[PDB]
């Protein structure tokens, strides 16, 4: 009676959804999106650009 | 119509009632009582003879 | 949401019930009918999406 | 599913059915009269990233409703209690051959 | 709920080793190697429509005596102090897999070796085998099974059956659920209540052991006599067209006539018969097995000790020092009994009664007669191969074939109402 | 009045994490039992509350929070992974039964934990997640033997420290195993952990002193201590049918409570 | 039964309901039965028509 | 109209428009709140939380509990009438004084 | 008409032939094979409002 996931399940509470962003995916993207930030800021890759 | 409802099915019979049932389980069951019947009276008069 | 009769009834045959291990025999046999060939399997997969 | 374990990751998935020379027991047999089983497909990851990306619902939902219009239909088949015996058939039939 | 999980194995009737031998566990595997066979059973009985038989099985109590000789020969192998389950033998049989799959073939190393020598009357616990701690869905399903052969061997007579009757077991599920069952016999009720515990074990308080329960009571209740057509247990009965034959058949129904009054509370006992000739009795067996396949989690009441054997005493689930009375009957005696009862209440007359008496004095006549004569035959065999021993039907005496406790069991029976 | 801890926990996380927590007011105060209440409410946030019937599903919270300067040195005091998001999972009802026929249907490969003494809020089992410690090398420790190893050294310093006429909050600190068993080999660390665990139940004392505060370097030793070559010397070994105890033990915590814990006559 | 003929069913089903008018073979065994089993004996009647 | 379970009706449709927005307990785990009004239609239907208004929290369910209040409280109320004459017409009466 | 009695709700209506000193086969009438206690009949909302 029992299927696996291979993420996070967590049930909703309404039935009129809305935009959300506490997410586990959500996390990951902004977490890829600010490494990106921070390669672009190191200071050995700025002086070119 | 006359007795073509008592011909459906197994014609032999003794008596006619009719019954309701509860939730909880109790039934009512309401038995007329037979006056009589003056032809068959008659018919077992002439048995006799 | 679904719904049966509630009366007495004529007796009816509907046999589908059977055991756990001949569900299991059945998808072992099937899961040994697919082996190592994707194309087998692929079509599964375009019915679910 | 294992996350980052990798001593708990799956290698082999295999099924028997044969025996070997004198075993008996199918528990003393089943590590080396087995087939391997299992095969990769691959996708693309542009699409996958294009639909991560934009998703969207109708303006104005409410799930229990469209669930309860989109369900209906699905559940008037009865294959499944048609391959109920299916399989009880074939299990009769192996049992009868050996 | 039930918190103790343990049970009894069969004890030797005289003989000096389990009374079962190669051709006998040969025919009980024949079509399948799983030793519990519960579906086996019933699809040999088929359905208690008529008289089986065979060479090697003469009736169907037969059959189930064997099935509980092979269980307790078989299951001392796991359950010595090594818990090691595939080094020894049984009558040239070894189990396939840890996990009590099957009984194949020995390898012959193992054939060469000697085999187990099994012992009567042992107490086992299931918690013990590892496996059967570590996974409690496999040992909530084989536990049904062990517990009705449990029932079978605690005493020496037929099986034990429960009767409970409580006003407050009823609900609105369990009114839609037997609602169903308005035209099928108690075989085929049976069948489909024993194949869903199979495929699921029942919680404490499930509609579905609730509704067992009610079923039982309601086949008990008709059985004595005190339920009938004109005076039903909130219109419901059971009816047998031909009283005392030897192949019976009972038949669910409902009435509108009239409803008894029943007393606020909860009630319960044990029922057993005591004559030879319950071998060839379906019902008796199939109740026997419904009150097992219960036995699963739902704590039944203790049996008082002075109503078993000294080596059936004090049973950590079954029995204890202070419990409910066994109470044993005789069917040629019951059927008096029910004809007695219903020509009291008033529908039933003199020249049925006498009707009904002789049929059944006929049937117990050709049962006692069969009986007989198999033990005999049996009794010679043993006598001429001094190796292999073995008993087809569980061994009686002469003195259960007269009437015991019927009265007062027939009496506490109408008096659980 | 009484207060609902669940719901204090639960409002203080919110308020802190910023989200919608209005709601969670009206449920402060208990009104028959802080489970029931909880069950009761059917539709709530859902990220610290789930109803599977009649057993309430409750995240496990960091127990330890790290400041900027930590950097996994020898000397820096061991976690034990209870500072990571999501640990552990615990699972409330009212009786063992009911809770053991609810893991018939649900998954527990990682393992399910026990305080069979007085637990934190009543009937509870623990299950891990799939995180770990890395703060101890060269070893890395899964979530169930790290909180393991933590009762059980809680338990030997209990058991060094311990005086007759002074209380203490648990008679048996250490955390046992109930379901899980076919996943756990035979030489592995959770099954000398559980050894270790009933051994500092029945009250054994370690030889070597153990700090006050532990240390990484402290933890690795014994870690290394553990998996070392040798054999079990005691007649102890760990079952999952219950707690066993050994007739002359100084322990009387079978006394003190109602089930788990079965003392054995014939092991001395 | 159903079926284009059925003089022949009605003669090979029931032996018993044959006379006995000489000493033939076939009339003593006939003559040598009981004369109560035949045709239907029971009957499950749950429903009126 | 005459059905019998027609309160239960009443209350049911209400409880089927309020998933999602208030929660009411029910006995088995087989039928939830979405389960249609339509479909109560015997007296072995009746919940317990419409027998026992207790179970009804005013707090999680607050319009659900007025709902359940009006219909136990101001639902009509049957009545008697005589008619025909007995003395000299009979009666057909059957379940009732004639 | 009961109310809001669920123990007093009438369930079921059949006819009987038989004398209440017998006992014959449960040959129940066609009526109570309803799973109300009468022929449905179905109304419309609209017009009654």
């Not at chain 5, 005076?231 to 030897?246: E, L």
């Not at chain 6, 207060?3 to 927590?21: I, K």
Request: with cysteine; net charge neutral.
């Amino acid at each position: 009676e029992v299927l696996l996931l291979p993420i996070d399940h967590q049930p909703a509470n309404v039935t009129t959804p809305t935009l959300d962003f506490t997410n586990e995916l959500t996390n990951w993207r902004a977490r890829v999106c600010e490494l990106m930030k921070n390669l672009v800021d190191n200071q050995r890759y700025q002086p070119g650009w | 119509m006359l007795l073509e409802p008592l011909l459906s099915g197994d014609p032999r019979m003794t008596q006619l009632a009719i019954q309701y049932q509860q939730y909880n389980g109790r039934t009512f069951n309401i038995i007329p009582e037979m006056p009589g019947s003056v032809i068959a009276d008659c018919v077992q008069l002439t048995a006799e003879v | 949401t679904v719904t049966s009769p509630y009366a007495p009834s004529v007796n009816r045959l509907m046999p589908y019930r059977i055991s756990n291990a001949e569900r299991q025999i059945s998808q072992i046999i099937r899961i040994m009918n697919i082996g190592n060939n994707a194309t087998v399997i692929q079509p599964v997969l375009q019915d679910i999406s | 599913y294992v996350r980052l374990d990798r001593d708990r990751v799956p290698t082999m998935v295999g099924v028997t059915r044969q025996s070997r020379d004198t075993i008996t027991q199918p528990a003393l047999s089943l590590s080396t009269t087995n087939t391997t089983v299992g095969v990769p497909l691959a996708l693309d990851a542009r699409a996958i990233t294009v639909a991560l990306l934009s998703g969207k619902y109708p303006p104005d939902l409410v799930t229990n409703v469209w669930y309860a219009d989109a369900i209906y239909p699905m559940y008037a088949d009865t294959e499944v209690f048609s391959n109920l015996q299916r399989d009880m058939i074939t299990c009769e039939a192996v049992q009868t051959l050996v | 709920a039930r918190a103790a999980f343990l049970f009894k194995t069969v004890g030797f009737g005289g003989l000096q080793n389990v009374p079962i031998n190669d051709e006998l566990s040969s025919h009980l595997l024949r079509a399948g190697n799983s030793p519990w066979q519960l579906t086996q059973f019933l699809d040999w009985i088929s359905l208690g429509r008529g008289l089986a038989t065979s060479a090697l099985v003469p009736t169907a109590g037969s059959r189930y005596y064997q099935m509980s000789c092979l269980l307790s020969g078989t299951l001392q192998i796991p359950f010595r102090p090594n818990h090691r389950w595939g080094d020894i033998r049984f009558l040239r049989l070894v189990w396939s897999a840890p996990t009590l799959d099957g009984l194949v073939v020995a390898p012959p190393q193992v054939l060469a070796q000697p085999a187990l020598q099994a012992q009567a009357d042992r107490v086992y616990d299931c918690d013990d085998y590892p496996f059967l701690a570590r996974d409690p869905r496999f040992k909530h399903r084989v536990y049904q099974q062990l517990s009705a052969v449990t029932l079978l061997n605690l005493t020496g007579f037929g099986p034990i059956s429960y009767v409970r009757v409580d006003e407050d077991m009823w609900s609105g599920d369990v009114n839609q659920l037997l609602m169903n069952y308005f035209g099928h016999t108690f075989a085929e009720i049976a069948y489909t209540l024993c194949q869903a515990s199979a495929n699921r074990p029942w919680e404490y308080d499930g509609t579905y052991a609730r509704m067992t329960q009610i079923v039982l009571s309601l086949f008990w209740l008709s059985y004595v006599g005190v339920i009938h057509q004109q005076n039903t247990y909130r219109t419901f009965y059971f009816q047998c067209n031909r009283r005392g034959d030897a192949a019976e058949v009972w038949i669910l129904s409902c009435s509108l006539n009239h409803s008894a009054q029943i007393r606020p509370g909860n009630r319960s006992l044990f029922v057993m018969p005591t004559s030879p000739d319950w071998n060839m009795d379906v019902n008796l067996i199939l109740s026997s097995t419904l009150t097992g396949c219960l036995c699963s989690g739902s704590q039944l009441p203790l049996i008082d000790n002075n109503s078993v054997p000294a080596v059936s005493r004090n049973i950590h689930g079954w029995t204890g020092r202070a419990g409910n009375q066994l109470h044993g009957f005789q069917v040629r005696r019951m059927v008096t009994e029910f004809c007695d009862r219903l020509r009291r209440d008033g529908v039933m007359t003199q020249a049925q009664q006498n009707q009904v008496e002789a049929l059944a004095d006929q049937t117990q006549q050709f049962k006692r007669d069969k009986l007989e004569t198999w033990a005999r035959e049996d009794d010679q065999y043993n006598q001429a191969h001094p190796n292999s021993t073995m008993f087809r039907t569980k061994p009686f005496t002469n003195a259960q074939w007269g009437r015991g406790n019927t009265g007062a069991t027939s009496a506490a029976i109408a008096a659980l109402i | 009045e009484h207060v609902n801890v669940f719901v204090a926990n639960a409002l203080v996380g919110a308020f802190l994490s910023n989200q919608a927590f209005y709601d969670l007011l009206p449920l402060l105060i208990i009104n028959d039992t802080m489970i029931g209440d909880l069950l009761g409410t059917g539709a709530s946030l859902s990220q610290f509350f789930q109803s599977h019937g009649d057993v309430l599903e409750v995240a496990a919270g960091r127990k330890y929070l790290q400041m900027e300067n930590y950097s996994n040195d020898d000397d820096d005091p061991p976690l034990f992974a209870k500072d990571l998001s999501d640990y552990a999972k615990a699972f409330y009802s009212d009786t063992y039964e009911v809770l053991d026929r609810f893991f018939w249907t649900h998954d527990s490969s990682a393992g399910v934990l026990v305080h069979y003494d007085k637990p934190t809020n009543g009937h509870h089992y623990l299950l891990g997640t799939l995180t770990q410690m890395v703060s101890a090398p060269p070893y890395i420790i899964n979530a169930t033997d790290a909180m393991l190893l933590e009762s059980c050294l809680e338990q030997f310093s209990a058991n060094v420290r311990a005086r007759p006429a002074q209380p203490v909050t648990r008679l048996d600190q250490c955390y046992h195993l109930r379901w899980g068993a076919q996943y756990v080999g035979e030489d592995s660390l959770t099954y000398r952990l559980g050894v270790l665990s009933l051994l500092a139940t029945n009250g054994y004392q370690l030889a070597r002193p153990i700090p006050r505060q532990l240390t990484n370097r402290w933890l690795s030793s014994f870690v290394s201590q553990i998996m070392s070559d040798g054999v079990n010397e005691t007649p102890l070994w760990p079952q999952e049918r219950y707690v066993q105890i050994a007739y002359d033990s100084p322990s009387v915590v079978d006394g003190a409570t109602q089930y788990g814990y079965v003392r054995k006559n014939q092991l001395r | 039964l159903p079926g284009p003929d059925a003089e022949k069913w009605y003669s090979i089903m029931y032996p018993t309901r044959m006379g006995t008018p000489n000493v033939s073979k076939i009339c003593n065994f006939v003559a040598s039965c009981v004369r109560n089993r035949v045709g239907r004996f029971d009957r499950a009647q749950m429903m009126n028509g | 109209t005459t059905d019998p379970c027609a309160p239960v009706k009443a209350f049911m449709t209400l409880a089927n428009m309020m998933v999602g927005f208030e929660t009411i307990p029910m006995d088995n785990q087989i039928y939830t709140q979405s389960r249609r009004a339509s479909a109560f239609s015997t007296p072995h239907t009746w919940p317990r939380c419409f027998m026992n208004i207790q179970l009804i929290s005013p707090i999680d369910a607050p319009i659900l509990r007025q709902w359940a209040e009006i219909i136990h409280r101001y639902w009509p109320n049957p009545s008697q009438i005589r008619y025909g004459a007995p003395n000299v017409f009979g009666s057909a009466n059957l379940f009732t004084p004639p």
